């Protein structure tokens, strides 16, 4: 009611008007007036303990492994940037698009190939996060990206 | 078969036209005419227009016979009011409502 465009004039006298008393038309009791406890820009972030983020990361990968859904690959053979090249490779490693994959690799080329698949979330090892590990059904990493994962939960 | 007419937005007070309409509901088209011609009411003129229009609809459009027409149903609905300012003493403004009417007459055929 202080940030609203109206004036601060009392609309009519306090007494003897036969009407209810009011001040200015900015008061939240009026149509078009201010908002009593409406939102204001907020910072929803907060500092989660690092060990909670390291345990959770390890634990998310652990969950997938205990399901037999974690698959480490040494390299992506024909994949040189083309989507048809990743699908070809995909079928060879048993990934037939009936399961959500989190492709985790520092290979710029291989991530270009698998970007557009509606069943692949694509990611670099530095970005490994549990929300993306858990929202996908299977997990696939480089031996290079797996080495990087081992550092972070060390 | 039925023939209907509707005069929408007649600038007259619904409560006032109804008095005239109540005279003719259920009367035959011939009595309804004589009754309307000697009703001492502004509303008579508007009802007569709607009545003769409904009768024209019957004969012309719906293959009904003038000699057998009666006023099977009629009613007056209230339409949107014209709101006007009426000045009073000591600086006060009153809102006159110039009300409006939707007059309806439905004729049927009184066989036999």
């Amino acid at each position: 009611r202080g940030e609203v465009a109206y004036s601060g004039r009392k609309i009519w006298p306090q007494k003897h008007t036969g009407r209810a008393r009011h001040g200015d038309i900015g008061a939240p009791i009026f149509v078009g007036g201010g908002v009593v406890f409406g939102p204001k820009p907020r910072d929803y972030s907060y500092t989660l303990p690092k060990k909670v983020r390291k345990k959770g990361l390890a634990m998310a990968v652990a969950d997938r492994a205990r399901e037999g859904k974690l698959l480490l690959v040494e390299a992506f053979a024909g994949v040189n940037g083309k989507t048809k090249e990743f699908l070809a490779w995909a079928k060879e490693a048993g990934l037939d698009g009936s399961e959500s994959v989190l492709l985790v690799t520092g290979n710029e080329l291989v991530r270009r190939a698998a970007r557009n698949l509606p069943w692949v979330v694509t990611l670099a090892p530095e970005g490994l996060n549990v929300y993306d590990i858990v929202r996908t059904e299977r997990l696939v990493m480089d031996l290079d990206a797996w080495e990087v994962f081992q550092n972070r939960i060390g | 078969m039925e023939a209907k007419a509707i005069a929408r937005y007649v600038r007259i007070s619904p409560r006032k036209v109804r008095l005239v309409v109540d005279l003719i509901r259920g009367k035959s088209l011939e009595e309804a005419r004589n009754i309307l011609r000697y009703t001492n009411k502004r509303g008579a003129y508007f009802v007569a227009k709607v009545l003769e229009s409904a009768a024209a609809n019957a004969v012309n459009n719906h293959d009904m016979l003038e000699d057998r027409l009666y006023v099977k149903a009629a009613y007056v609905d209230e339409g949107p009011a014209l709101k006007r300012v009426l000045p009073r003493a000591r600086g006060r403004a009153d809102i006159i409502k110039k009300r409006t009417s939707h007059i309806t007459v439905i004729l049927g055929e009184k066989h036999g």
Partner: peptide
Amino acid sequence: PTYIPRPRPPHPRL
């Protein structure tokens, strides 16, 4: 809300 007609004075109940 144009003009505020001031109300009549009360009966003096003193």
